Every structure is written in structure tokens, then in C-alpha cells.
């Protein structure tokens, strides 16, 4: 029996859920993109609901909830893809339906991105990464956003405390052979950051150009 | 205060 | 008394280097930008040899050696300007003789950029980042800097490992009241890893303008 | 190899 927090946060862990790219539409780069921006809005929803399963997170004032979300939405949604890709090679599952290989990436004009994607990818392979640190981390990733507009940053720190401290004794536990393995994994934390960044001004730029779609919560967390 | 974000966040 | 590699890379640490601004060049944001740029052309060359006192680092092929710093010197080069603010108020020391504050930043066009490294001080004054801390960090940067190119995989591992280690012995040793310093430590790389992509997208840009003269190793690392 | 990052590693 391990850290009740991570159990916690297993058990918040949202359902997965259906890319469903439209079978009517030819494919493209612009039905690629439609399908990845529609699929991100639909989680991002998942993702908000899920936060306030976070112990503390809905004690913030709705001002730093918001700005913590506004800052690691898209380290959340890769964080999910790099979960569901352990168990394959080179190829990112954005879907049960929506599985991009490197030829797909190249179609969509995604090969960069998706590359890093793959990098964090085979990092967390080497590591074994397990769905108790998968869950921290996202955790992490939320309250170590580093938002500039934070109004409680004492608040703040204590949420990153409690679950940088959730993520250490889950280690201290679990992975004796290793006393350094929690340490190691918040050392992965800055390539998230790096491929999160790439990702959004990829995605702001494809919301400048005009043809793609996007739904209002997925534009408002771009605009953000 | 138009925001879906902030609309969501305070939805029960 | 306290860990051998943290009392190695004090000792390694390079001697301050003045920007000298020229002072017959009326002050322009092509004045500003020029220095810094000649700036950073000359602790480029100091970082280089620094590197080389970092255990192990010599022993990677020099094609690993060239990987790290072409991924991680715009980090290295924030992190100095960052440890040389900490005892000012929202004004970043590049250089003794070269302190730049909001107005400043304004005049170079350098507001956003200067305002991400100041809360990367902010962040490091409220932990009172020590300088055994500093340089322990800036060689982790450097291990830790996530290149596409990397040959021996397990040998940066190992050179991430050692110098983790280094940081959890400090800190074990120095900092028994927050047994989770080490890991809040790691915590502040993400901003580091953020704050680097934006400088080197920003000197990039202005590299491609053509107005502002920029010297050899300097570009070879932009160019990177 | 005509890398100055690579002249300066080599560099003894
Ligand atoms: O990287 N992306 O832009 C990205 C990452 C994860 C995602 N999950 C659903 C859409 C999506 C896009
Ligand atoms: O952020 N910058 O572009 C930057 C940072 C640190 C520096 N030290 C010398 C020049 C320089 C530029």
C-alpha cells in the first residue's frame, strides 16, 4: 500500500476518449489538424474537471486555478499522448482511434513537434515510467506551471509541496533500488515544458493562417 | 468574466 | 565540510567579464543588442573550458561534448545573469558594468524576454539560492539539456546521475530542515529550460534582421 | 570540423 495521494489521483483519472476523425472528409493536413484541435477541446474539459480532484487546487482563488490551467493545458494533453505511446514504437496515440505514425506527422506538417513528442516518449521508456508517476507528474507539471499572474504564490508552493512530497514517497516506497528515481523524473519536467511550448505557438500560428477550426475552450486556452 | 474556462471551473 | 563535486565547481567557477559598452556608440536597442550579443560571444568561449572541469564531461566523444553546450549554452548564460541579480531589485546584471532595468529592457526590446529571467531571480531569491546551489544547477543544465544528438545515451545518464547525486548530498548535508530542497531545486528547471528557448528564438530573429553584428561562436550556437 | 565549438573543445 503506497502515498494516498497518488491512489487519489489514479481514481481521478479521466476516461479516455475518441478522436473521431469525421470518415466523410478526405484525408489532409487540415482534417488531421481539425481532428487533433477537436480532440483537445474535448479534453480539455476532462482536464479542468479532473483539476479539482487535486487536493488543494479548488481552495485557490478561481483567478490562480485559472492561471495555472491557462499556463500547463498542453503539458497535461502531451503528458496523456507520451502515457498512451509506452507500448509502441515511433508511433504517438492520440486516440484509441488517432494513432500518428512519422509518414501522418509529415502529412500534417507535425514532424518537428511529434518528434519531441517521441523524444519524451523514449525517455519514460527507459525509465519504465508506471501510471502512479504519470499521474504525479501531471499533477506536478499543473501546479509547477510558473504562470507570471499568480495572486497566492505561498498557496502555490504548497501545492507543489504536497504533491512533490506525494511523488517522494511514492519512491521511497516503491523504488528502493533507486533513491534518486523521484529526482529523476522531476528531471524530465523541462523537455515537457520545452515540446508544451513548441506545441502551442505551432497551434497559434495554425489559429493566424485561418483554415483550420477550433472550438472556443481550445481557442481561449491558445489566446490565454 | 465571459470566460468558458472560468464558466466550467465554478460548474458543480 | 560538504560534497567534493559542489567544492570542485565552485573552484571551476570563471572570472567576471565586463560587457564594455562602447562608449563613443550612441545608446540604441543595436547598441544594447550588439553588447550583449559580443557579450555572450566571449562567456561562450569561457563556458566551453568550464565545461571541461565538469567530471566526466571530457570523457563523452567530442560530438556528445558539442550536443550538451549547442543544447544548453543559452541556459548556462541565464543562469549567471540570474545568480548576479539576486541581491538587486528588477534589474538584471549581465555584467558589473552593464545592469539593465525595465526602462532599459523597453529601449532594446527586450521587456518580455527580461521579464521571464527576472522571475526566474524572483523564484531563486524567495528559496535563497545559494552559490554552491548555482553552479551545482548549471551543471545539470548542461547534463540534462535533452539534444536530439546525443551517441552514448547511458554516459549523459551517468553525468546527469553524478551531478544529481551531488546536488541531494549538498542539500542532505546543508538543508535538513526541507528534506525536499534538492527535488525544489530541479523544480526551478523548467523555467530555466523556458526562458532559454524564448532568448534563443529572440537572437535568432535578430540574427535574421541582419542589423546587429554578430560574432563567430555566437552564431555557431544560434545556428545550432 | 571547421566548428569553432569544436576548435575550443580540442583545445588543450
Ligand atoms: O502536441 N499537441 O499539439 C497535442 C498534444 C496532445 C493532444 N491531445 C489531443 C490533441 C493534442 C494535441
Ligand atoms: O537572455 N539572453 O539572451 C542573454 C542571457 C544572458 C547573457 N549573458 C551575456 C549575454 C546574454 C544574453
Redesign the pocket.
Given at each position: 500500500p503506497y502515498n494516498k495521494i497518488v491512489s487519489h489521483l489514479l481514481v481521478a483519472e479521466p476516461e479516455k476518449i475518441y478522436?473521431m476523425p469525421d470518415p466523410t472528409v478526405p484525408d489532409s493536413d487540415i482534417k488531421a489538424l481539425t481532428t487533433?484541435?477537436d480532440?483537445?477541446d474535448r479534453?480539455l474539459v476532462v482536464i479542468i474537471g479532473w483539476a479539482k480532484h487535486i487536493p488543494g487546487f479548488s481552495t485557490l482563488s478561481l483567478a490562480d486555478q485559472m492561471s495555472l490551467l491557462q499556463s500547463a493545458w498542453?503539458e497535461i494533453?502531451?503528458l496523456?499522448?507520451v502515457y498512451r505511446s509506452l507500448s509502441f514504437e515511433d508511433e504517438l496515440v492520440?486516440?484509441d482511434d488517432y494513432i500518428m505514425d512519422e509518414d501522418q506527422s509529415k502529412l500534417a506538417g507535425?514532424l518537428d513537434?511529434?518528434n519531441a513528442?517521441l523524444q519524451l516518449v523514449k525517455k519514460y521508456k527507459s525509465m519504465k515510467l508506471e501510471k502512479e508517476e504519470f499521474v504525479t507528474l501531471k499533477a506536478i507539471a499543473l501546479a509547477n506551471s510558473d504562470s507570471m499572474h499568480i495572486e497566492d504564490v505561498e498557496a502555490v508552493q504548497k501545492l507543489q509541496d504536497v504533491l512533490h512530497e506525494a511523488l517522494q514517497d511514492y519512491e521511497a516506497g516503491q523504488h528502493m533500488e533507486d533513491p534518486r528515481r523521484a529526482g529523476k523524473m522531476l528531471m524530465t519536467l523541462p523537455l515537457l515544458r520545452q515540446?508544451?511550448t513548441k506545441?502551442?505557438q505551432?497551434?497559434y500560428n495554425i489559429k493566424l493562417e485561418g483554415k483550420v477550426p477550433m472550438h472556443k475552450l481550445f481557442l481561449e486556452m491558445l489566446e490565454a | 468574466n465571459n470566460s468558458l474556462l472560468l464558466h466550467l471551473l465554478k460548474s458543480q
Open positions: 478522436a487533433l484541435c480532440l483537445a479534453e498542453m494533453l502531451i496523456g499522448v492520440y486516440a507535425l513537434l511529434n513528442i515540446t508544451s506545441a502551442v505551432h497551434f | -
